[PDB]
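yo

u said u wanted the structure for the complex thing, so here. seqs first:
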Amino acid sequence: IQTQQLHAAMADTFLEHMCRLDIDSPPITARNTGIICTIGPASRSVEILKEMIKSGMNVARLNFSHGTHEYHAETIKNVRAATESFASDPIRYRPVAVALDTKGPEIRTGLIKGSGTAEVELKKGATLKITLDNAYMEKCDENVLWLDYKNICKVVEVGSKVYVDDGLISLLVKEKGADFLVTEVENGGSLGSKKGVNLPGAAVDLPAVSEKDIQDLKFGVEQDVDMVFASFIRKASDVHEVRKVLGEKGKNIKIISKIENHEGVRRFDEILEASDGIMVARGDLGIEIPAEKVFLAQKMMIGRCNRAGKPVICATQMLESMIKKPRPTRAEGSDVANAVLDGADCIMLSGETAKGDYPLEAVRMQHLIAREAEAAMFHRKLFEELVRGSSHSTDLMEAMAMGSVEASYKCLAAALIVLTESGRSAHQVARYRPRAPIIAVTRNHQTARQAHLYRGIFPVVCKDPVQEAWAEDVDLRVNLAMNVGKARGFFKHGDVVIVLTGWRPGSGFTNTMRVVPVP
Amino acid sequence: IQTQQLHAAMADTFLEHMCRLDIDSPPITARNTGIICTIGPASRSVEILKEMIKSGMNVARLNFSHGTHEYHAETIKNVRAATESFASDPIRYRPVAVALDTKGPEIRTGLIKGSGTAEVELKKGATLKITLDNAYMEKCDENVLWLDYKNICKVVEVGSKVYVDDGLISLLVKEKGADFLVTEVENGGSLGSKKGVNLPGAAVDLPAVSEKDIQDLKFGVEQDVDMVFASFIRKASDVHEVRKVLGEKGKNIKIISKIENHEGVRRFDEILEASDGIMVARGDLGIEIPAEKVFLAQKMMIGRCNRAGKPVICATQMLESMIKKPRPTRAEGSDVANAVLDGADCIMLSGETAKGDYPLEAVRMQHLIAREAEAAMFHRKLFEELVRGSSHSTDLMEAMAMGSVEASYKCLAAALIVLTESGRSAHQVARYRPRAPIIAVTRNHQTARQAHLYRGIFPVVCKDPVQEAWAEDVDLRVNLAMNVGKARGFFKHGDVVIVLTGWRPGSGFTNTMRVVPVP
Amino acid sequence: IQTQQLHAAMADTFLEHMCRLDIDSPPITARNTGIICTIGPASRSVEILKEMIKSGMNVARLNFSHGTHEYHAETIKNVRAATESFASDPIRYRPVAVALDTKGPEIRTGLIKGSGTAEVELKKGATLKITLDNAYMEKCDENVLWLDYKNICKVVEVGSKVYVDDGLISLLVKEKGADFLVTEVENGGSLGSKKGVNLPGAAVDLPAVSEKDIQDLKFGVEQDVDMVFASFIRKASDVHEVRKVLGEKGKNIKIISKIENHEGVRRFDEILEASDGIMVARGDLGIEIPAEKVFLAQKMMIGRCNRAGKPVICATQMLESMIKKPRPTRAEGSDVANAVLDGADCIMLSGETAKGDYPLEAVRMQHLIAREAEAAMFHRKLFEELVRGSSHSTDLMEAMAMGSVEASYKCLAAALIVLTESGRSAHQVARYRPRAPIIAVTRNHQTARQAHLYRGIFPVVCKDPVQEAWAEDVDLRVNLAMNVGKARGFFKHGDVVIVLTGWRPGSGFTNTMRVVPVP
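structre next:
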């Protein structure tokens, strides 16, 4: 019995590979998939934030649908407080990225001033009028419901369906007025305040980047966020728009478009081209397009992204039962294993961490599942298919990367060390999917934060001054990477490690490779 | 834009196949994966049972952990009442199978006579003693908990964990007495009566087939059940034991072993050999072995079964949020799409149908998802890999099957018609995974019921007397199969269909194949 | 140790397949590659022609570069005399096809009336003038050489090379006159009369179909030849030209274009489209294009033809040492094994049979080598790659063919029986490369003759009148095919055989398949 699934690793066919999966083949200590946690009331604590960092949280996400800039700054503050409390031991310091998840063309319900009403239980077949007249803006109730979108009457047909509270509630547009819609409760259930509304099949003319958006992003640049999760991207221009607002001072903030509608699925290719990565926002996507179709959209996007060399994040409701329960469902565990198996660079925790009872437990589960699915991949077939996808390129770093990843497969390297500052080089190695961790040593801080988007990169910040002699400088960083790998238990003295570094100070890319045993 | 995913179907690599998945490529009307519904309070109604039949329920499952034989007979009665209400139109009649899901070596909690107590909320760190002394057998409470397993003290070590209510509650065995265990509530939560207990790492000496079991099975033979879902199979003998109880009168009842422990995973191969099919019982398996490992065990078993030609059923918590909600989670939709993609012959609904609010909705969802994942399979690669798995056999029906399935791929047949009585022949075609439905015309009733275990078979019962002339008899059945395919909308006049039939009355197997247009 | 190379047959990789080739794995009695013999002085004898027929000669070729129509008619006469001497036993009768190999835009040397001269040995560096002045038309000698091509001076540049006697002699065009060329003997050697001249890089404006050609072809239609080997095809029009001369009475004569220049390699695709098959005429091709390139041109053409479903014949100098020796060279044996391995439908014997000392020995060698290389093919990989080449077609006979060929692979059929009259159906089976022989039973005579062009078809002529009952008629032919297979030793009672036949009298194609044991 081999370890880390090396037996299934040797199969000639995918079916053989599946038949050979062993639940007694222990994975390796390293976990390559990045976990992104949505920060909320259940996790804003610096204390809980340290526990989350120690549990593998990599990127802290900030949903700007909710909260005041003041509330967010203090979140960024705490997040930074906890990340830096470990800054003391550079060998045990883990940079955590910060992500601004934008509030998109979001339509939401008004306020239910019907406060006497314990639960505004809506019942099947009942009627409910929807008003744009903002006098009931706060007097929402089972009978009259107010909403954001002022051009909704122009967009909907008598007969359309309206989805509130994550499509849980469906309304049939029975009658249409000049500024209201007489609907019928198709799906009864209790509705709350400010719930989100989805108009599948409707042409929402709302803009990608609104005034609110322009302010949240500008606060984003100011608070020096690493990446931006932009909601509702329908086209490549939306991305150029988001980009223009960030300007020069936002020149390095990575824009991750969120495909959560049909248009973005249609226009996917153009979007991917223009973005820095992609997010499969299962939530709205699954209300915008038929829920049965979602898995198709997900695999197409992860495969395409994997093909192009762009990070891709699978999101929403992955371990959701864990908001109230300490263990996920059987369906939830497979959902996570299959996203890693699908090739997702990062997986995400939202309600599970934002306001759930089991923040940390959720984190460790994604960690556990991620570690195991990563071992269950069919690297050989995957790399061949990936090598072939790229056929048209003659790129040198891609060559160093393929070559390095190929060498690691043969000698079963414990990891790959990449000395990088801009991050491009480590990115390329991560793209050809090695089985071993990629320790990325850099003195650039944004680089180390943002390297979390990529599968396999374990970023490490070198806090030592630069050495006069390039070689000394190189070995300085290589020992840093070694002492870390050994402290983290990724490898021990005597193990073999592939090392990618530049020949001379101005090498352009990682053009030298060595196969060295761990000292 | 092709339909039914024919574009992705043409890919040279699995990555290409993934990149080509289109959410605008409508599947076909036929759904090949069999849906198994667990019958409970929410579905015992003949009226709801007709609605469930019209919604695609194929096999009714009866969990013998609960209920009285009297309660079950009436369930079998109603199930039969509803199936036969359609018996009138043989073209629209759908045989529904009945499955006896055995109560295995099940350990359960006592009764909580602590009735004054609204909710016996157990809290973290608290202590709780577990007694075998059956005086508290009904006086269960937060302080004293009684259980089934009388040899539990011999099996556990001080330090072990005990899982109650589907592992939701974990107890640390702090102290051990001669007939009790002083445990500590590791996971606080409200515990109910008769909950199930799991002892991971413990050697439960309970038997596979108990006295209760011997009676439930004998009632099973008597009520003429089609298959048996046997719980907790640890080895090939357990299966021979279950088999021996069924005897000669149970000679045709299909025994499906349920792998829900570690031993059955270990001994899997021996079990598969001895069973008629397998069930991946995610529930207990996920409490018996680390939940992170489960997806491994599932894929290994589905691949291995797919390899051998044995039906395999993926089960438990597939659309569970739908017990209280009308729409599943994003994680649940992928769980179902991935089991079909994994190759599962049948998928199952338990709490979702047994006592859930949305019985029918759950059914149609599995139906929807199943239909779409079936189109997203990589048939070409799958068939090649399957053809290769079989390499060692020179079997003639396997040859007719491979040949037929290959021909269907080329001409894009609307379906495959198989005239079978024993079912063996249609089974072989289903094993090489054609893309088109397999209409199985038979005059045998158990055959048509039990053909649900196999992916792709749409069983049809011929209610006409036998014709003196074999040819006439053959064409009689072939038109039956055609009128059905047309009524169900699987194909229309002019479409092409592959037809497998016997040359002469005593052919042994389906040895003649024709490519005929639909009249 | 398996037989017929079944072990290598099971390999997962081509390298594995090669490593597994066993010289102790006896092939099967049947040989599928068709042997084409060029008839000459050494084989015009009816007696030698029977021996050649008994030795596997399949198609008799008639090179119209040489001979008088009177000489050819008597050859056709003898060929027919010998074929029909076996006509007595229909079970042992073998139809032999007749092929008219056209004299193309052929340039040839004049007559050497320098008869006193024992051998007109030309020596290096010497000079030699080439005259169009036909007074020396017969007075050819080492000093003055006359030739056919009257527009040669317009075509050549001072500096060009002229190739005489199959490029064995090379001349450098040192000086150019108005109607002569002062050349220099680059390659000295003895030159004979009427030798052929090749002008590589020259634009020969000679026509594809000349007056001579128009007469030879019209004699071809008249003598009722089966196929036509048309020399020097440069384009698709040349083929339409050859076709137009055959007219309606030549409507069934198969036109096989001979690619023996660079243009035909360039225009290959257009030619293939327009022809009935192709011939890789290595002789001139190897003087027209650099000899090192030839193997490239050959494999490209055989692969492309194999891809399209068109017969392809590898020709010239395959066993040439056997003109004077009784055993071929080591290089010659591999040349033949590699053409079969390459996928060549037919292989050819020219000088080896035309005027060689060992006519019969040459035949049996091609037979021996062919039989063994056919076993060394990688059918599995070949069929998959072939199935994929065809992807775009949904053709029903192609489906029956793929399906049949797939079934034969699984059950290891001893042969495939195809009841055909027009031959189309058997052709399709042969195209997906089964491992077993394809016995083609037909009552059509041209069909049975011309079925030799295709790899695997063992044509059989049914000489029985038609039966009133289609079924009886079908079984009549199937037993014919069985008694033949048994007489030829291809299979014995108890062996399995795939049988392709039409359902009813007017089936359109072979749409019914059965797997039957040999009676």
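Chain B has three domains: 1-30+374-519, 31-104+208-373, 105-207. The first strand of chain B starts at residue 34 and ends at 38.
cya
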